[PDB]
Amino acid sequence: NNTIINSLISIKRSNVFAVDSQIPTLYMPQYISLSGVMTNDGPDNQAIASFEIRDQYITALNHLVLSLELPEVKGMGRFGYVPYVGYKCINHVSISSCNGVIWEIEGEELYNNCINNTIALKHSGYSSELNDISIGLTPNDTIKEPSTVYVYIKTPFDVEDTFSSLKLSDSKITVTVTFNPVSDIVIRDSSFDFETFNKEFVYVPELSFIGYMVKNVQIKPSFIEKPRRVIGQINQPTATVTEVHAATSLSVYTKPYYGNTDNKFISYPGYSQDEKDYIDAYVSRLLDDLVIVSDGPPTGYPESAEIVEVPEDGIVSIQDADVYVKIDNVPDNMSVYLHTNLLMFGTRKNSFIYNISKKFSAITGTYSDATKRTIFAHISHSINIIDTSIPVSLWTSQRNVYNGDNRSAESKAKDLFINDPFIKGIDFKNKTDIISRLEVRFGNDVLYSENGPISRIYNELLTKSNNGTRTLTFNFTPKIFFRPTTITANVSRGKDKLSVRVVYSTMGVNHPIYYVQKQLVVVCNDLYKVSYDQGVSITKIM
Amino acid sequence: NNTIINSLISIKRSNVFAVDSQIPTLYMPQYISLSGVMTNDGPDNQAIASFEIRDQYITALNHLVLSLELPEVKGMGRFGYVPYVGYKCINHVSISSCNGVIWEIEGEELYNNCINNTIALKHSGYSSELNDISIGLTPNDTIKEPSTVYVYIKTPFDVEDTFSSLKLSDSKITVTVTFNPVSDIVIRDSSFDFETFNKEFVYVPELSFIGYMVKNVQIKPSFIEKPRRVIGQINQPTATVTEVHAATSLSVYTKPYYGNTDNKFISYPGYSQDEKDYIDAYVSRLLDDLVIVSDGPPTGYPESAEIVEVPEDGIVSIQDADVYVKIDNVPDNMSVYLHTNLLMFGTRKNSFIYNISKKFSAITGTYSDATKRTIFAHISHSINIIDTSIPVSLWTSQRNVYNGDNRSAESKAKDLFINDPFIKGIDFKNKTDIISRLEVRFGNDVLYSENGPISRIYNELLTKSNNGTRTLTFNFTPKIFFRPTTITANVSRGKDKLSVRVVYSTMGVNHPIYYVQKQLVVVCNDLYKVSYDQGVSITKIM
Amino acid sequence: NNTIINSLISIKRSNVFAVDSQIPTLYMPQYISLSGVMTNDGPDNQAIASFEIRDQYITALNHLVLSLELPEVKGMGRFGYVPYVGYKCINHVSISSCNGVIWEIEGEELYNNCINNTIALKHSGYSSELNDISIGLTPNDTIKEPSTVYVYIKTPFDVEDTFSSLKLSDSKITVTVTFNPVSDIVIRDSSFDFETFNKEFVYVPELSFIGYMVKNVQIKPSFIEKPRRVIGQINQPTATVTEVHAATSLSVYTKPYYGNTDNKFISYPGYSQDEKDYIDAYVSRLLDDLVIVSDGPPTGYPESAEIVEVPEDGIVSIQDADVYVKIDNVPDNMSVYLHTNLLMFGTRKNSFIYNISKKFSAITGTYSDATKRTIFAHISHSINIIDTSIPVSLWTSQRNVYNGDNRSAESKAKDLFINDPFIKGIDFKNKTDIISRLEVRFGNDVLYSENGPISRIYNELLTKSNNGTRTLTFNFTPKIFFRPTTITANVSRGKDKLSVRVVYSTMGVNHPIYYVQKQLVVVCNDLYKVSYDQGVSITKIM
């Protein structure tokens, strides 16, 4: 061993075993919490909370956390909050000064920036207590107990802590939070008295931040990135963000538009949010009408329903599709029935039929004489996240030549209103990639084009995220310590804008998901200079 | 595309594409492992392992890892290790030189610092193999096979690798590990011969660390943070840490005190540690006594037990509560019975009753003729984490007007001794927040006060942790490269101390968990200067 | 509160609230994707894709991503891709210039470097769509739909983004990807027409990278680490990497060699890759032959099979082992049977026996008259990851004194060919540590020796990984900004090499897994200097 030590044993070297331990600026942090001023004026009387931060001792601040006291939900229907309820109820956030807006973000973009922060996401409300679809039995029954959720309003001032902090520069800072209508953050059946709930519900907010009391602060200018959103017209595959002079990134995604529907869906998995969870919740809801053990032909189904007695061999053939169903402990007086067309969709009477019953291979279970119901054991099916994301209105579409919804009255009563504001793609999990081509143009010249989502793969790799978006990043320079790298305009050559064009993929004219309306969302991060001369001021880089 | 590359094309610029690649200090790392010296003197003859580090070539060190050789557990009872068994058996760790203690930590605080390190936590012993509750059948049977567990003793010397490393100078460094009783790290039934196990069990430790052999080390002074904790009096909502002169943080949490009990609990979920897992383990244990299938009235239950035959409609009414129990394949000669008061608690006769049977709404299952038992299918219940965290001693408490434990002898035999040293709150998962208010005072002046756990929300956000504590951090300055920012005393004004006052929520005099004793835990991180002049020396900042 | 802000209120201090915001090098990033040139000119017509990056505008590059287009798999057998299919089909990657190879890696080492990057791993092909063992029913049936996977080729140029980027000193850079045969990345039964699949399968690659267009680049030299591996002779417990002059790390692991077998295994868990998942998949496959309900003695099993009728008390004794099997709803004309020796191994008659039936304690379930099969409720067993990792060839081994595979013809038909190239250890999860002692020698001198895998514990702790390897790291100096610390050679003493010796564990008294052939793997990271005098050049540090 000693011979290797002697093999170890003159150049100028950097000390990697000691540090010169520099003394920082003298400061003292403090967690400050303020109650706001609530306003409900004009646009559908929307809720706006205003917080004024004016202190001679608060020199700088960062890490904004908005808390919300959710009330006790009493009643008789089925009710649950959407996952991350705290983020979903934020429509817009705006930080301002005497000189105007310093930074502002749309609710969905704040969520998108925090999507990879599991801690922040939990805090906003991701619990079985909140997200499970609870049931009221009596008019005085408690559906949900009161709860407090915490929303981390991630800002550019948190990146490098004290270094990136917002300096107040002897000015009043006003944080303004615009809320989404409570209908958005709630999942309910028709049975629930939403009318009374909507009237009585009030957002109860409190803004908290980390304040810094700094002795002899030496302020210098900085740069900030402001996200700017462009939502295209319904089913328009283009968006243009004008006046692009110094952008650090460009993000592209799609959103479904459910305005052509009642926002009612057959099932929701609640707290369990995996792709398998959405599917299982759906299959579970259909099974009660799909396999019926009755004496004799089942009653209470539309005349359009084709309920067939299962043969001795257990195989029911629905055209090309074969469904094997074998139920144990069936009474001698009863028979096993299969609903041959629970949900079906067709463009013409001679067209291809999209039938949900055809999506089942094998159904096995045991009948309970005690509870007079079937307890399914093993199911073989080809159901997917797209089926679970079909608004019930699209099965009943004018475009559908058949009845479409052949379920029982009971099943239809259990349908849920889902108005989740932050849905992407055409499914609840944004699994299906509906973009075949992406084309970005700086002016009239093609800046980037792709077929596969390589820009999404890079976005996920570079940010270590499981939920990325097709993103072009122009800045690979360290934040705060350097002026960000940007795509830079040439007004003379008319390179004032970024135009995005997509080429969507298609399904059969016979799949209800074909009729889901899409909107293209383009997000641009513009570079701004922060000056602290006469209070806090921001200037667009040009 | 070329017009955009021409749109890209004199200011002083920082090179972001090249680096000057500076030569570091000449060193050679080495993984060194040492066997210690075991001592069992004085306080209940507690186990203390001592490791002496001194090598003409070891210049500096970091990343301490304690290996523990767990023996083969042979015998007849039910036995399991606590999750993260390696951390749980550490009572205290102390690094010291000829000049005295350099750094020391209480076992629970070392665990708290490593709670967000999933890798370190797995290494300490978190598996099906160690943490499941295993069963012995013969006196020579193997309950547990031998295993090695690795405990990462996180120190302030690992933060910035070689830069933050502990320099040994020429002094002898002594690492001293104080071990908790084996009783603490084991979960067992009464059937297990713990008496023989306790006598025969010996901690078998080995300390490993990364040692650096540095040629011509140039040592400079440093700063280190030392955690200091104060445990309040049983049930007292106050604690004070005296002599606070330069603290970087203050943390507040509570701990249950189970000294007033036998430390016996009805159930443990083993390796599965989710809130649902604790609850499911509990429900599973109760169900065997809760719904009985017998010919006729069930036998072998206390006279105080009220077992009722389930009516034809399947609904059994226990006062206000309605329990629906429908079991399939019941023999013709037998009936279904419900235990109306399995577990009961009352402080007064003909007054409020905490009844565990009332916590069930629906119970379905099928009777097995082959194994003469019920295989429960679906259970609707309101059992919580608190219920699963009630010691069984409290159900039998002298406060209790009722017998309380109306379970079978068989059920009671399956109860488990749990002595896990690192339990927080009043439940096994520290879910229930028992602090309504927190008030911190620097001297006589209020430094901070809160109602909601905002300080915990910030602690979780700032440290990216799922298991935070109400913490006030005063240092937001980068570690190692800067002198930490601290709350600084003014002895003249009497600002020598930090006094914590909480306000506890209450469960109610008729809830068995009301009788769980609490302890306030206040943790203060004091700033210290490290000098390497005459061996390693530390000096408290004042 | 104000008295504490006055308690806050001259030394030179570092500004922690402002930054001088330095302007970076003027650049513009771009995501570039190129189609390659496919070659199959030996050794065994192995597929080699070549990508040439020659651009007057591309100054530097990093973040290489290989996309592969997987075709539609049509046919009749059972087929599934291996988890992380994208990484598994890479045999070798080589980046080179006019001056030769700059950096190259063996496919397994690229995977090992990316094993802790969950995002990259998902992208390469980890999904129920890709990894589930799918079934074809007709010769025209679609087993797998077409899919695209993305393989992140992690290089030393991504570490510090633009700073660590590969500069192209106006030279053509050629990326060369060598592909493993498609057999390696596929899991199939005998029924599948692999012959036609292998003929028709073609790798369809596309290389993507982040190019940087830099104005007035100021290039400086750098250092790079190149992984180099040596695979020992079959069952030889030693390996030696020659010409070691400046290594930053040394890694040691073993690989099973399944060449002495048909690469057929009884079960695979598909997408579900937990240790429990592998075990459950295995137990599920054995159960159909383990507990038989027939009239009367079961038929279609080898004469060597010992199938016993389960007694009234339900307990069947297989020597020391007791198996309790209780099946419900068994017809009056039928009996319950237990296969006493489903799989048995021995190298000597009337000596030790490894019997898989003996690894079961209890088996319960209910017979379905409807599907004429047993639905197993609860199983008590002692089956582990090793048992699921034993090739069927070892049961049929010449050394085996018994028949070995006493399963039904049906069971044997469901066996799967697994040729996963990146298997470590002797089990599918590399859980079992088969090294009792490790000894590393730099020349003739012992550099390091250990018994337990402390080097693996440190590797996992230091890199924050769940799947580490026994690794000695010599560099603890920050990458890019410093010349890496290395173990240095002394050619005179013959310290030119690193010689590793291992003592494999006996793996138990009579385990078939002891006859799985092992290959000791040693990986060395050699330090290379990157120079740009004329084009891009590398030089091995000596």
Author numbering:
A (entry chain B), B (entry chain A), C (entry chain C): 2 to 10, 15 to 547
What's written in the study?
The structure of D13D513G was solved by SAD analysis of SeMet-labeled protein crystals, and refined to 3.0 Å resolution with residuals R/Rfree = 0.170/0.203. For the structure of D13D513G at 3.0 Å, density has been attributed to residues Asn2 to Ile10 and modeled (no density is observed between Ile10 and Ser15). Overall the D13D513G mutant is almost identical to the wild-type protein (0.3 Å root-mean-square deviation [rmsd] over 533 Cα atoms). The mutated residue, 513 lies in a solvent-accessible position on the outside of the trimer. The orientation of the trimers within the PRD1-derived lattice matches the electron microscopy data and the morphology-modifying residue 513 lies at the interface between neighboring trimers. In addition, the mutant structure contains well-resolved electron density for residues 2–10 at the N terminus of the protein (not observed in the wild-type structure), which form a short α helix that precedes the long N-terminal tail of each subunit. D13D513G and wild-type D13 trimers differ only in the additional short N-terminal helix (residues 2–10) visualized in the structure of D13D513G. This “hook” projects upward from the trimer base and is wedged between the V1 and V2 jelly-rolls of the other two adjacent subunits in the trimer, contributing an extra 1152 Å2 of buried surface area to that subunit interface.
Trimeric capsomers of the VACV D13 protein form a transitory, stabilizing lattice on the surface of the initial spherical immature virus particle. The crystal structure of D13 reveals that this major scaffolding protein comprises a double β barrel “jelly-roll” subunit arranged as pseudo-hexagonal trimers.
